[PDB]
Amino acid sequence: QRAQKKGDIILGGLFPIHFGVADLKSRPESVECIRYNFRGFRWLQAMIFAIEEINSSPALLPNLTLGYRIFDTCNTVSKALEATLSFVAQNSTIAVVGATGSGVSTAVANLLGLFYIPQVSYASSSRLLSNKNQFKSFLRTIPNDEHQATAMADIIEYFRWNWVGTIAADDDYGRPGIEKFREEAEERDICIDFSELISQYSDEEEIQHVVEVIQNSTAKVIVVFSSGPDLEPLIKEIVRRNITGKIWLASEAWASSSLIAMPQYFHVVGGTIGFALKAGQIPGFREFLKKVHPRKSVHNGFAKEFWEETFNCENISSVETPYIDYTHLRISYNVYLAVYSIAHALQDIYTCLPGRGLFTNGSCADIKKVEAWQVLKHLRHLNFTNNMGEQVTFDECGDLVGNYSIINWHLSPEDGSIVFKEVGYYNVYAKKGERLFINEEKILWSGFSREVPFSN
Amino acid sequence: QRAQKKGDIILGGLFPIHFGVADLKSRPESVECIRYNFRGFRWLQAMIFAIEEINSSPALLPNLTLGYRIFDTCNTVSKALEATLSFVAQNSTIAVVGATGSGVSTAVANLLGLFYIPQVSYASSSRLLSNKNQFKSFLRTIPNDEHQATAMADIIEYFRWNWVGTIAADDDYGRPGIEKFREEAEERDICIDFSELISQYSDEEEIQHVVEVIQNSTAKVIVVFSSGPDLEPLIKEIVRRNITGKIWLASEAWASSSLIAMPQYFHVVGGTIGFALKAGQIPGFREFLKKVHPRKSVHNGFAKEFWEETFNCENISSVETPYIDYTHLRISYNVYLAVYSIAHALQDIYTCLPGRGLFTNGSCADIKKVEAWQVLKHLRHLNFTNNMGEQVTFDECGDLVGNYSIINWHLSPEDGSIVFKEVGYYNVYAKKGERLFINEEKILWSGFSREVPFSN
């Protein structure tokens, strides 16, 4: 299954269409995914949507079509790596949209970097990815977790808390991020009661042990740096243990994750203050999402599966699912800018006056035979503006930043569903000590109480 | 340059023959190594030595020759990855000796795992490599750093110290290891004055900052988890800063590293207590090392370089160098067992009675057409004995353990060189609290003083 389309310029794509895959008595026989990832399918959608829009856009890259080769990482390096090999078979993909996971992106960046194939991630936020010495051809349209780690400490200090816990996934997006927060704390005089590591495949024993350490601890505030899949197993047992009254500080990855944000668990996950990326605006994207259908599209071979999953195999709106059930496009917007950033780099090459080329002898690149390294060069020196009206320009470490959005989980009496209410903002562009804004109101501590909890 | 030799069974090899490699105005043009790694060349030597010995060994694998395909990782994933691709071009290498670096091995294990190619590392000691969920085809002949992290804490508690520092390389062999030690401390009531991260390519500013944090701190004991190259830059400035009286606790990687262990720095690096792996015994290896010569051997294309480096381009003994200047073979012995472990696995396949096969239907594998996954199966269930007289059998996470050797750096008045005197032992096979033995004598605190230093 691969969303593929013919084009003069081919752009690779790696998306988590699923959440994870299922001795050697025989051939390994590969492995199969076992959990469809709605929203993740809406991701590749944006990518394809942006490609179509730019093809229909005469101003951007005229007399030139752009094709795409998009696969499924399924939150597994193995499937992601097999794909990355398929991308560098000739070395042709001029660029590949980075994967979402920090660990998955790390591995793909290793191979892609060897051939200097520009990789623009849309979710990877691991500080380790900023090592251009190893990740030379890595670029990310999402802020690193260094800023996030700082914001959490600010919030804990803001509510006068000195006794807190810690739970991070045993992988790139968590262990490194927590390290930064640990350093953020202690300096602000915030003692850490306990530190725990969880995984999507933690043994039931491990889960029991971490739940045991969650209890016992007198700390009521517990910071959590983990994606939805890794924290899914832990929260499940916490729910049956019915451990309530523990306030959780989400970490973006699971701040808007439906995997954890479900009414059946609101008893414990209720009132979880987390961090969301600034909501972007992709116009005409809603209609594109509704115009999906098997037999139709054809290129997006991923539709069949989607349809089977959304219709137990008919209007998409008929069946509720995170695919079209969205209020703010955040990571989806990141993907849109990611493909647009490459589009502008290619357009720059298409429009480079001789003697004004960033290449040697001020020479330009023949887009008729553009090379990936040439795109990387331009991508490094990219300074265009966003559709939202915002100058976009990757930094020296190929990273662009943006303010966060403090969010608090609240229950809606209309449908009993979990509505995420913005409660404050964190201005990254601001100065230190004047970057955090949290309206004390709109904060339902522990899902209901409106009195700041005690955590000393 | 590749040490290659024809054989029915081909075993890959990745060794750090060097210590590291040297915009996009033009094609990247690859990169070149810039520091020969003596001892590292002595490593591949052992590998080749073991291959020859087993070929000349009729009992082990009769009527069967074994060829090798060995390259240079040069402490760089990029060169290492390019090699790993060369190994899986057909997928043929039945097995590849793992690299030395934790980060380099991690990446190679990703690709090798995809094709289930058994990888047996000889130095990689990163706990993260024990994640068989990701590293399914990873096996290591060296203990993880979890045991080491425990030993350090024991030593600090043994000498009644509560105020200590921390300096780890910003990579797999350091950041994860220190995390374990941090947890080891605090529990033993050992406060950490400061924690710093260093790299082989840390900016001079970074070096100045870490040296500044090294000073100021009242902590006299400073634990250091880093390989020789990463700590080389920091120690250089500490020497010019002439910061003396600071006791250092080596971490195996640099406990016997000539890069740091040099008389010109004994003023600061003097009296550094570190951890060394149990010394193994490879018989007849000395003569093999002396029988090296360009024009001769031919297969080891790495000789030319070696010769140029050892003779500024003649008897090898004439020129002193860590290649033949060795008193205890440790990692070299690890490589010997690594290739022997594969040899025994292949011999098991060569001798499997029908109906007694670890494969389905109790079927054996046709060694005439042996597959890598079949070798992996056998490697998992390997239980042979060492030449030193020791049963060798990888654990569930493909890791074998061994007692460590507390070492203290001492100056020899005969040549003014830095002699490493064994001072104690750490029995991993022993119980908790009864595994650490450090003779208080033979300990020259700060290189000279014989009075336990004060670090509160």
Author numbering:
A (entry chain A), B (entry chain A): 24 to 45, 50 to 118, 137 to 358, 399 to 541
Paper text:
CaSR is activated not only by calcium ions but also by a wide range of amino acids and γ-glutamyl kokumi peptides.
By adding calcium ions, γ-EVG, and two PAMs, etelcalcetide and evocalcet, we obtained a cryo-EM map of the active state of CaSR at a resolution of 3.97 Å. To obtain more detailed structural information about the binding mode of γ-EVG binding to CaSR, local refinement of the VFT domain was performed, and the density map resolution was improved to 3.55 Å. The ligand density of γ-EVG was identified in the amino acid binding pocket of CaSR. In our cryo-EM structure, the amino group of γ-Glu, namely the N-terminus of γ-EVG, formed a hydrogen bond with the main chain of Ala168 and the side chain of Glu297. Glu297 of CaSR had no hydrogen bond with L-Trp. These results suggested that the hydrogen-bond interactions of γ-Glu with three residues (Ala168, Ser147, and Ser170) were conserved and may be important in the binding of amino acids and γ-Glu peptides to CaSR. Only valine and norvaline at position 2 in γ-EVG maintained high levels of peptide activity at the CaSR, suggested that the second residue of the tripeptide may be tightly bound to the pocket by forming hydrophobic interactions with the hydrophobic cluster of CaSR. The carboxyl group of the glycine of γ-EVG formed a hydrogen bond with the Arg66 side chain. The critical role of Arg66 in the recognition of the carboxyl group of the tripeptide in our CaSR/γ-EVG complex structure was consistent with the structure–function relationship shown in previous studies. For Arg66, which interacted with Gly in γ-EVG, mutation to alanine reduced its function compared to the wild-type, but mutation to a negatively charged glutamate residue completely abolished the activity. This observation strongly suggests that both the hydrogen bond formation with Arg66 and the positive charge of Arg66 affect the γ-EVG binding.
